[PDB]
Structure 1
Amino acid sequence: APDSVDYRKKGYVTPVKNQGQCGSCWAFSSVGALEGQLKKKTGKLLNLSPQNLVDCVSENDGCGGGYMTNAFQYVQKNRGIDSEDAYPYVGQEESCMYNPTGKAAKCRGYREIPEGNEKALKRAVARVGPVSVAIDASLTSFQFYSKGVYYDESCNSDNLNHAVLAVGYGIQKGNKHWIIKNSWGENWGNKGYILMARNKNNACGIANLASFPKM
Structure 2
Amino acid sequence: IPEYVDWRQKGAVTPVKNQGSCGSCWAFSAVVTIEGIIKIRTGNLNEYSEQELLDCDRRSYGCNGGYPWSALQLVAQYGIHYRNTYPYEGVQRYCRSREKGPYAAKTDGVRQVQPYNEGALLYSIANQPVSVVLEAAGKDFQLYRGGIFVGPCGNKVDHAVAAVGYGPNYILIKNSWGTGWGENGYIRIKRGTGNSYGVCGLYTSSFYPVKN
TM-score interval, smaller chain: over 0.9
Q: Which position in structure 2 is the counterpart of 1:147?
A: 146
Q: Which position in structure 1 is the counterpart of 2:33?
A: 33
**1:40-59 maps to which residues of 2 (within 5 A)?**
40-59=40-59
Distance in 1 between residues matched to 2:5 and 2:122, nearest whole Å:
10
Q: Which position in structure 2 is the counterpart of 1:190?
A: 183
CA drift of 1:143 comes to 1.1
Distance in 1 between residues matched to 2:192 and 2:64, nearest whole Å:
31
| CA deviation string 1:79-107 (max 9, x = no partner) | x1001000011110111000462522111
Distance in 1 between residues matched to 2:91 and 2:130, nearest whole Å:
25
CA drift of 1:168 comes to 0.2
Q: Which position in structure 2 is the counterpart of 1:104?
A: 104
1:95 aligns with 2:94: yes
Aligned residues: 207
Distance in 2 between residues matched to 1:34 and 1:23, nearest whole Å:
19
| CA deviation string 1:120-179 (max 9, x = no partner) | 0001111x21100000011111111112110124x111x1111000000003xxxx0000
Report % sequence identity: 45
SS of structure 2 residue aligned to 1:212: strand
| CA deviation string 1:44-67 (max 9, x = no partner) | 001100000000000111100011
**1:129-168 maps to which residues of 2 (within 5 A)?**
129-153=128-152, 155-157=153-155, 159-168=156-165
Does the 8 Å CA contact 1:86/1:102 hold for their aligned counterparts? no
Tell me how large the CA RMSD over aligned residues is: 1.0
SS of structure 2 residue aligned to 1:83: coil
Does the 8 Å CA contact 1:55/1:97 hold for their aligned counterparts? yes
Distance in 2 between residues matched to 1:76 and 1:177, nearest whole Å:
30
Code of the residue aligned with 2:148 in structure 1: it is V
CA drift of 1:17 comes to 0.4
Q: TM-score, normalised by structure 1?
A: 0.94
For structure 1, the 5+ residue unaligned runs are none
Does the 8 Å CA contact 2:35/2:45 hold for their aligned counterparts? yes
Distance in 2 between residues matched to 1:88 and 1:152, nearest whole Å:
34
SS of structure 1 residue aligned to 2:15: coil
Correspondence for 2:200 among 189, 201, 204: 204
Q: TM-score, normalised by structure 2?
A: 0.95
For structure 2, the 5+ residue unaligned runs are none
